[PDB]
Amino acid sequence: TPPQLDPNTPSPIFAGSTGGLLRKAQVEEFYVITWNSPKEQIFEMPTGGAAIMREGPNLLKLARKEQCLALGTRLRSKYKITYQFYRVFPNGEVQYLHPKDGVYPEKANPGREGVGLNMRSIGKNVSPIEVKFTGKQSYDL
Protein backbone atom coordinates (compact mmCIF):
# COMPACT_ATOMS: atom_id res chain seq x y z
CA THR A 1 0.00 0.00 0.00
CA PRO A 2 1.13 3.59 -0.60
CA PRO A 3 1.38 5.75 2.54
CA GLN A 4 -1.14 8.58 2.77
CA LEU A 5 -0.90 12.18 3.99
CA ASP A 6 -2.67 14.28 6.63
CA PRO A 7 -2.56 17.88 5.35
CA ASN A 8 -5.24 19.90 7.16
CA THR A 9 -7.55 17.59 9.12
CA PRO A 10 -9.44 19.28 11.99
CA SER A 11 -9.45 18.07 15.61
CA PRO A 12 -12.14 16.88 18.04
CA ILE A 13 -13.78 19.18 20.57
CA PHE A 14 -11.77 19.08 23.80
CA ALA A 15 -11.63 21.43 26.77
CA GLY A 16 -7.99 20.77 27.63
CA SER A 17 -6.24 18.82 30.38
CA THR A 18 -2.86 18.17 31.99
CA GLY A 19 -2.32 14.78 30.34
CA GLY A 20 -1.16 16.18 27.00
CA LEU A 21 2.19 16.56 25.30
CA LEU A 22 5.42 17.38 27.14
CA ARG A 23 8.99 18.47 26.35
CA LYS A 24 9.70 15.13 24.64
CA ALA A 25 7.31 16.06 21.82
CA GLN A 26 9.31 19.22 21.11
CA VAL A 27 12.63 17.42 21.62
CA GLU A 28 12.24 13.80 20.48
CA GLU A 29 8.99 12.80 18.72
CA PHE A 30 5.22 12.53 18.90
CA TYR A 31 2.46 10.55 17.18
CA VAL A 32 -0.59 11.48 15.08
CA ILE A 33 -3.73 9.36 14.69
CA THR A 34 -6.33 10.00 11.98
CA TRP A 35 -9.72 8.37 11.44
CA ASN A 36 -13.12 8.98 9.83
CA SER A 37 -16.43 9.10 11.70
CA PRO A 38 -19.92 8.98 10.14
CA LYS A 39 -21.67 10.90 12.94
CA GLU A 40 -20.86 13.21 15.84
CA GLN A 41 -20.48 11.25 19.07
CA ILE A 42 -18.69 11.35 22.42
CA PHE A 43 -15.70 9.11 23.14
CA GLU A 44 -13.20 8.78 25.99
CA MET A 45 -9.68 10.14 25.58
CA PRO A 46 -6.73 7.99 26.73
CA THR A 47 -5.40 10.98 28.71
CA GLY A 48 -8.49 11.36 30.92
CA GLY A 49 -11.87 12.92 30.29
CA ALA A 50 -14.31 12.74 27.41
CA ALA A 51 -14.22 14.42 23.99
CA ILE A 52 -16.56 14.75 21.01
CA MET A 53 -15.50 13.64 17.52
CA ARG A 54 -16.76 15.77 14.64
CA GLU A 55 -18.48 14.09 11.71
CA GLY A 56 -16.00 13.48 8.91
CA PRO A 57 -12.22 13.19 9.18
CA ASN A 58 -10.62 13.60 12.60
CA LEU A 59 -7.00 14.02 13.68
CA LEU A 60 -5.35 13.77 17.09
CA LYS A 61 -1.86 14.20 18.55
CA LEU A 62 -0.51 11.88 21.25
CA ALA A 63 2.79 11.20 23.02
CA ARG A 64 3.30 7.42 22.75
CA LYS A 65 2.38 4.62 20.36
CA GLU A 66 0.55 2.67 23.07
CA GLN A 67 -2.05 5.42 23.49
CA CYS A 68 -2.58 5.56 19.72
CA LEU A 69 -3.03 1.80 19.46
CA ALA A 70 -5.38 1.70 22.46
CA LEU A 71 -7.55 4.46 20.99
CA GLY A 72 -7.55 2.77 17.58
CA THR A 73 -8.49 -0.63 18.97
CA ARG A 74 -11.28 0.93 21.04
CA LEU A 75 -12.58 2.70 17.93
CA ARG A 76 -12.47 -0.51 15.88
CA SER A 77 -14.10 -2.61 18.61
CA LYS A 78 -16.92 -0.20 19.53
CA TYR A 79 -17.61 2.18 16.62
CA LYS A 80 -16.40 0.00 13.69
CA ILE A 81 -14.14 2.73 12.33
CA THR A 82 -10.97 2.51 10.24
CA TYR A 83 -7.94 4.42 11.53
CA GLN A 84 -4.25 4.98 10.86
CA PHE A 85 -1.41 6.64 12.74
CA TYR A 86 2.01 8.09 11.91
CA ARG A 87 5.06 9.22 13.88
CA VAL A 88 6.32 12.80 13.59
CA PHE A 89 9.92 13.96 14.22
CA PRO A 90 11.19 17.45 15.14
CA ASN A 91 12.77 17.98 11.71
CA GLY A 92 9.38 17.53 10.01
CA GLU A 93 9.67 13.94 8.77
CA VAL A 94 6.37 12.01 8.85
CA GLN A 95 6.64 8.22 8.94
CA TYR A 96 3.68 5.96 8.20
CA LEU A 97 3.29 3.55 11.12
CA HIS A 98 -0.04 1.69 11.16
CA PRO A 99 -0.81 -0.98 8.68
CA LYS A 100 2.25 -0.99 6.45
CA ASP A 101 0.90 -3.54 3.96
CA GLY A 102 -2.58 -1.98 3.99
CA VAL A 103 -4.05 -4.92 5.93
CA TYR A 104 -4.20 -5.63 9.64
CA PRO A 105 -1.41 -7.77 11.14
CA GLU A 106 -3.81 -10.45 12.41
CA LYS A 107 -4.64 -11.39 8.79
CA ALA A 108 -2.09 -13.43 6.85
CA ASN A 109 -0.86 -11.57 3.76
CA PRO A 110 1.35 -12.90 0.94
CA GLY A 111 4.60 -11.08 0.31
CA ARG A 112 5.47 -10.58 3.99
CA GLU A 113 9.06 -11.22 5.10
CA GLY A 114 9.65 -13.29 8.22
CA VAL A 115 11.87 -11.97 11.00
CA GLY A 116 13.04 -13.72 14.16
CA LEU A 117 12.25 -17.33 13.26
CA ASN A 118 14.14 -20.26 14.81
CA MET A 119 13.41 -23.64 13.21
CA ARG A 120 13.86 -25.69 16.37
CA SER A 121 12.13 -26.43 19.65
CA ILE A 122 12.69 -24.10 22.60
CA GLY A 123 14.66 -26.86 24.34
CA LYS A 124 17.21 -27.25 21.54
CA ASN A 125 19.12 -24.09 22.49
CA VAL A 126 22.78 -24.52 23.40
CA SER A 127 24.11 -24.06 26.91
CA PRO A 128 25.56 -20.64 27.86
CA ILE A 129 29.02 -22.23 28.20
CA GLU A 130 29.14 -22.86 24.44
CA VAL A 131 28.70 -19.16 23.62
CA LYS A 132 31.08 -17.84 26.30
CA PHE A 133 33.70 -15.20 25.43
CA THR A 134 31.78 -14.28 22.26
CA GLY A 135 29.40 -11.45 21.48
CA LYS A 136 26.54 -13.73 20.43
CA GLN A 137 23.77 -15.27 22.53
CA SER A 138 22.40 -18.80 22.64
CA TYR A 139 18.90 -17.83 21.47
CA ASP A 140 20.36 -15.81 18.57
CA LEU A 141 21.98 -18.90 17.01
Binding site: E66, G114, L117, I122
Partner: protein, 80 residues
Protein backbone atom coordinates in the same frame (compact mmCIF):
# COMPACT_ATOMS: atom_id res chain seq x y z
CA UNK B 1 15.37 -3.02 22.47
CA UNK B 2 14.28 -6.43 23.74
CA UNK B 3 14.55 -9.60 21.64
CA UNK B 4 11.45 -11.49 20.46
CA UNK B 5 11.88 -14.91 18.85
CA UNK B 6 9.42 -17.35 17.27
CA UNK B 7 9.89 -21.12 17.08
CA UNK B 8 8.44 -23.67 14.68
CA UNK B 9 6.04 -25.24 17.20
CA UNK B 10 3.58 -22.42 16.44
CA UNK B 11 0.14 -23.47 15.17
CA UNK B 12 -1.02 -20.07 13.89
CA UNK B 13 -3.87 -19.29 16.29
CA UNK B 14 -3.10 -15.53 16.00
CA UNK B 15 -3.57 -14.84 19.72
CA UNK B 16 -0.13 -13.26 20.22
CA UNK B 17 -0.67 -10.81 17.35
CA UNK B 18 -3.97 -9.69 18.86
CA UNK B 19 -2.53 -9.41 22.38
CA UNK B 20 0.32 -7.05 21.45
CA UNK B 21 -0.31 -3.44 22.58
CA UNK B 22 2.33 -1.80 20.34
CA UNK B 23 1.90 -3.64 16.99
CA UNK B 24 5.11 -5.65 17.05
CA UNK B 25 4.00 -9.05 15.70
CA UNK B 26 2.23 -9.95 12.46
CA UNK B 27 1.34 -13.10 10.52
CA UNK B 28 2.97 -14.48 7.37
CA UNK B 29 2.16 -17.50 5.19
CA UNK B 30 3.89 -20.74 6.11
CA UNK B 31 3.92 -24.41 5.13
CA UNK B 32 4.33 -26.72 8.13
CA UNK B 33 0.98 -26.45 9.92
CA UNK B 34 -2.73 -26.93 9.33
CA UNK B 35 -3.39 -23.18 9.57
CA UNK B 36 -0.71 -22.54 6.90
CA UNK B 37 0.62 -19.46 8.69
CA UNK B 38 3.21 -18.44 11.28
CA UNK B 39 3.91 -15.35 13.37
CA UNK B 40 6.81 -12.93 13.03
CA UNK B 41 8.21 -9.94 14.94
CA UNK B 42 9.49 -7.31 12.48
CA UNK B 43 8.87 -4.20 14.61
CA UNK B 44 11.13 -5.35 17.43
CA UNK B 45 12.15 -1.78 18.36
CA UNK B 46 8.60 -1.05 19.61
CA UNK B 47 8.52 -3.86 22.19
CA UNK B 48 7.93 -2.82 25.80
CA UNK B 49 8.19 -6.21 27.54
CA UNK B 50 4.63 -6.67 28.84
CA UNK B 51 4.81 -10.39 27.89
CA UNK B 52 1.15 -10.58 26.90
CA UNK B 53 2.08 -12.67 23.85
CA UNK B 54 3.57 -15.29 26.16
CA UNK B 55 0.44 -15.04 28.32
CA UNK B 56 -1.71 -15.93 25.29
CA UNK B 57 0.01 -18.91 23.66
CA UNK B 58 -1.25 -22.53 23.75
CA UNK B 59 1.72 -24.93 23.73
CA UNK B 60 3.68 -27.17 26.08
CA UNK B 61 6.13 -24.28 26.23
CA UNK B 62 5.77 -20.93 24.52
CA UNK B 63 6.51 -20.75 20.80
CA UNK B 64 7.08 -17.00 21.25
CA UNK B 65 9.82 -15.90 23.63
CA UNK B 66 10.74 -12.43 24.89
CA UNK B 67 14.21 -11.75 26.33
CA UNK B 68 14.77 -8.39 27.99
CA UNK B 69 17.73 -6.45 26.62
CA UNK B 70 19.12 -2.91 26.33
CA UNK B 71 16.51 -0.34 27.35
CA UNK B 72 15.72 2.95 25.62
CA UNK B 73 13.03 5.62 25.71
CA UNK B 74 10.52 3.47 23.83
CA UNK B 75 11.06 0.27 25.82
CA UNK B 76 10.92 2.12 29.16
CA UNK B 77 7.41 3.47 28.55
CA UNK B 78 8.31 7.12 29.15
CA UNK B 79 6.09 9.97 27.95
CA UNK B 80 8.16 12.86 29.34
Amino acid sequence: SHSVKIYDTCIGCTQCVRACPTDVLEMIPWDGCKAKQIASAPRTEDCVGCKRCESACPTDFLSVRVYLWHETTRSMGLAY
